[PDB]
Design a protein around this ligand. Structure first.
Ligand SMILES: *[C@@H]1O[C@H](CO)[C@@H](O[C@@H]2O[C@H](CO)[C@@H](O[C@@H]3O[C@H](CO)[C@@H](O)[C@H](O)[C@@H]3O)[C@H](O)[C@H]2NC(C)=O)[C@H](O)[C@H]1NC(C)=O
Ligand SMILES: *[C@@H]1O[C@H](CO)[C@@H](O[C@@H]2O[C@H](CO)[C@@H](O[C@@H]3O[C@H](CO)[C@@H](O)[C@H](O)[C@@H]3O)[C@H](O)[C@H]2NC(C)=O)[C@H](O)[C@H]1NC(C)=O
Ligand SMILES: CCCCCCCCCCCCCCCC
Ligand SMILES: *[C@@H]1O[C@H](CO)[C@@H](O)[C@H](O)[C@H]1NC(C)=O
Ligand SMILES: *[C@@H]1O[C@H](CO)[C@@H](O)[C@H](O)[C@H]1NC(C)=O
Ligand SMILES: *[C@@H]1O[C@H](CO)[C@@H](O)[C@H](O)[C@H]1NC(C)=O
Ligand SMILES: *[C@@H]1O[C@H](CO)[C@@H](O)[C@H](O)[C@H]1NC(C)=O
Ligand SMILES: *[C@@H]1O[C@H](CO)[C@@H](O)[C@H](O)[C@H]1NC(C)=O
Ligand SMILES: *[C@@H]1O[C@H](CO)[C@@H](O)[C@H](O)[C@H]1NC(C)=O
Lengths: 72, 49, 86, 49, 147, 147
């Protein structure tokens, strides 16, 4: 199940701090963060989610996490 | 946008503009072309769109 | 701090060219006698009213000042809008 | 401008309507006082609630 | 203050054509507390090659004005010495309108500074022939003399 | 009538002066962009420009990888009332737009002939205020370089 979860979510657990940009080329620079409701200018970061599937060591730790129930 | 002209090419995005030029004219620059100190204080100039 | 605001304002002026105006003010259940004489060769008027300490007719006031108001009804001035050339 | 009352003169320079409005409301109806209401779209204003 | 004649004048101007119209108006005062029954003459012409349209409002008593002819080079001085802020008992207390008397003068809100600087720039004025206009300076000096 | 026509033709002359300045600027902008070749490599071929949202402190680390920033010398002009440097044109890049992308860097490249034409426009008409190319990629490049 941790080898099928790599071939299914490998590299796809990436996300950009700015919702509009969805590629690492685009997520450079600054952006206005309206979502906090106070209009502050932030920096665009290209990040993974904290619990990946990008590797067998990382698909076994994020899948034990599901087994213990938390944050699944 | 004038990239393909007289050697006519595909014109991918040659229908958009590059931008808009703009030069400011201040209303104090216009009030010096209409001097009011030869008129009585009740007289004045005014323009209109 | 402060914001822009349509403020209706009023001004008054001598409507008529006559110099003497007399009458009795029709106050609530009382009578107030007055005579207005406009001084010649000036902008002043002499109001000779003879009634004080009588019943109060001060229901409202005429406030000649820049009072905050809404503007003209914009739903009405789009039916016959001002002349305009596009 | 003043009055003979010696108390109105304390509020010298006030609009007469702020004191005895019935007088000049009537006077307006005799038409010794016309008036005009006009708007000043470009005037500063206290922030209301 | 909107009339029905002024609406006509506005619609005439917007059409970009020239004209002239004298009539009796209601001129709200500058302090927004009084109204006068004025007597104005609206002359207007279109600004060529543009969408605008210029007009000059002019009272009937404003068709003439005073052009101060002070070219003796010493009469202007004999009127100017009277404005100094030390003689404020033979003459009254004066204020000077902060106009563009000329480019070296810089107008301020501290009116006494403007009166001073105006006096110094009067002091050496003869070399400033192509610098600053004889019209306003002569008119103000002559008005100071008459006052 | 004479005063109205005189002031109207003076205003027409002013507006046509600025219209001719606009014509010159747009001619050069179209001609220069028509003779521009796309790129994606600005590490070696720097685009040197002043970014209007910069710090006056002499901090070298305020620059960006693909572009080397200018540190201008700001003199005081009472015509504009702010800090002005007539040697180059500032650039404004919105906070939501990255100043290092390829579109922005190409726009920053083909718009220095605009610097030259801005300067030559102001030389002919010393009274000119802001003249600016508002780019369709988000840039504004106004001539008198001010923060
Ligand atoms: C004005 O129009 C011209 C073309 O009409 C624009 O130039 C063209 O811009 C496109 C997109 O920026 C270029 O295509 C790109 O080419 C590169 C390299 O070949 C490639 O890696 C990209 O994937 C993309 O296909 C194109 O080469 C370029 N030139 C021509 C002749 O088409 C120009 O950008 C327009 N003006 C502005 C301000 O954008
Ligand atoms: C502003 O104040 C002026 C004061 O001159 C007002 O103009 C006057 O308004 C009254 C009431 O509408 C007019 O009275 C009527 O006049 C017609 C024709 O003169 C007459 O046939 C009627 O029997 C009635 O008496 C008066 O004529 C008019 N004065 C002028 C010179 O036009 C004006 O209405 C006020 N308001 C505004 C928005 O201007
Ligand atoms: C440093 C990379 C991640 C290390 C994860 C360590 C735990 C992985 C196995 C968890 C238990 C799976 C059954
Ligand atoms: C004068 O007062 C009467 C009675 O209150 C009122 O109906 C009228 O509208 C007023 N004005 C005129 C011009 O009659
Ligand atoms: C200008 O004023 C005079 C007298 O004050 C008056 O007779 C004349 O009618 C006024 N002008 C116009 C156009 O009404
Ligand atoms: C203005 O400045 C002058 C000189 O600096 C001074 O003499 C004068 O009192 C000032 N007046 C006001 C109202 O600040
Ligand atoms: C505008 O041009 C027309 C014809 O070209 C001319 O008759 C008119 O006098 C001009 N107006 C001014 C204010 O010069
Ligand atoms: C128009 O530009 C010319 C430059 O040849 C200049 O000499 C002239 O003063 C300008 N006109 C105005 C009204 O600024
Ligand atoms: C574009 O960049 C190149 C490389 O620096 C430069 O030689 C060229 O002059 C630039 N284009 C313009 C219009 O300045």
């Amino acid at each position: 199940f941790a080898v099928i979860a790599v071939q299914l979510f490998k590299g796809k657990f990436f996300y950009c701090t700015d919702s509009s940009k969805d590629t690492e080329k685009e997520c450079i620079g600054n952006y206005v963060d309206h979502e906090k409701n106070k209009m502050e200018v932030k920096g665009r970061e290209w990040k993974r989610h904290e619990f990946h599937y990008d590797n067998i060591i990382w698909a076994l730790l994020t899948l034990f996490t599901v087994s213990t129930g938390e944050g699944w | 946008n004038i990239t393909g002209q007289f050697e006519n090419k595909t014109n991918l995005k040659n229908q958009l503009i590059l931008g808009v030029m703009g030069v400011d004219v201040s209303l104090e620059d216009i009030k010096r072309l209409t001097p009011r100190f030869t008129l009585c204080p009740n007289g004045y100039y005014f323009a209109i769109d | 701090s402060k914001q822009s605001c349509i403020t209706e304002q009023t001004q008054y002026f001598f409507d008529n060219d006559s110099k003497s105006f007399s009458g009795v003010l029709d106050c609530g259940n009382c009578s107030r006698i007055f005579h207005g004489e406009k001084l010649m060769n000036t902008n002043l008027i002499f109001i000779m009213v003879e009634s004080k300490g009588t019943c109060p007719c001060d229901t409202r006031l005429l406030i000649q000042a820049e009072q905050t108001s809404d503007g003209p009804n914009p739903c009405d001035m789009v039916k016959q809008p001002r002349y305009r050339k596009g | 401008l003043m009055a003979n009352h010696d108390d109105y003169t304390n509020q010298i320079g006030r609009f007469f309507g702020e004191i005895d409005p019935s007088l000049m409301r009537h006077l307006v109806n005799i038409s010794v006082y016309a008036f005009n209401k006009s708007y000043d779209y470009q005037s500063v204003c206290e922030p209301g609630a | 203050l909107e009339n029905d004649i002024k609406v006509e004048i506005r619609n005439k101007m917007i059409d970009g054509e020239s004209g002239e119209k004298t009539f009796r108006t209601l001129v709200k005062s500058q302090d927004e507390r009084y109204i006068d029954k004025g007597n104005r003459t609206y002359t207007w012409t279109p600004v060529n090659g543009t969408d605008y349209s210029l007009a000059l409002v002019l009272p009937t008593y404003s068709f003439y004005y005073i052009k101060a002819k002070l070219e003796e080079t010493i009469t202007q001085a004999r009127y100017s010495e009277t404005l100094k802020p030390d003689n404020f008992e033979e003459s009254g207390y004066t204020f000077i309108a902060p106009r563009d008397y000329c480019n070296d003068l810089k107008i301020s809100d501290n009116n006494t500074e403007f009166l001073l600087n105006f006096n110094e720039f009067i002091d050496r004025k003869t070399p400033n022939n192509p610098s600053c206009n004889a019209d306003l300076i002569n008119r103000v000096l002559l008005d100071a003399g008459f006052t | 009538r004479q005063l109205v026509e005189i002031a109207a033709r003076d205003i027409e002359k002013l507006l046509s002066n600025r219209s001719k300045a606009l014509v010159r600027l747009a001619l050069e902008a179209e001609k220069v962009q028509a003779a521009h070749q796309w790129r994606e490599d600005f590490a070696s071929n720097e685009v040197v420009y002043y970014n209007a949202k910069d710090d006056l402190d002499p901090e070298k680390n305020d620059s960006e990888p693909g572009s080397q920033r200018i540190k201008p010398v700001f003199i005081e002009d009472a015509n504009f009332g702010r800090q002005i440097s007539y040697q180059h044109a500032a650039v404004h890049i919105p906070t939501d737009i990255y100043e290092g992308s390829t579109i922005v860097l190409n726009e920053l490249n083909w718009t220095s002939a605009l610097d030259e034409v801005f300067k030559k426009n102001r030389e002919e008409d010393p009274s000119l205020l802001w003249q600016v190319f508002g780019s369709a990629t988000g840039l504004a490049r106004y001539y008198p370089a001010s923060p």
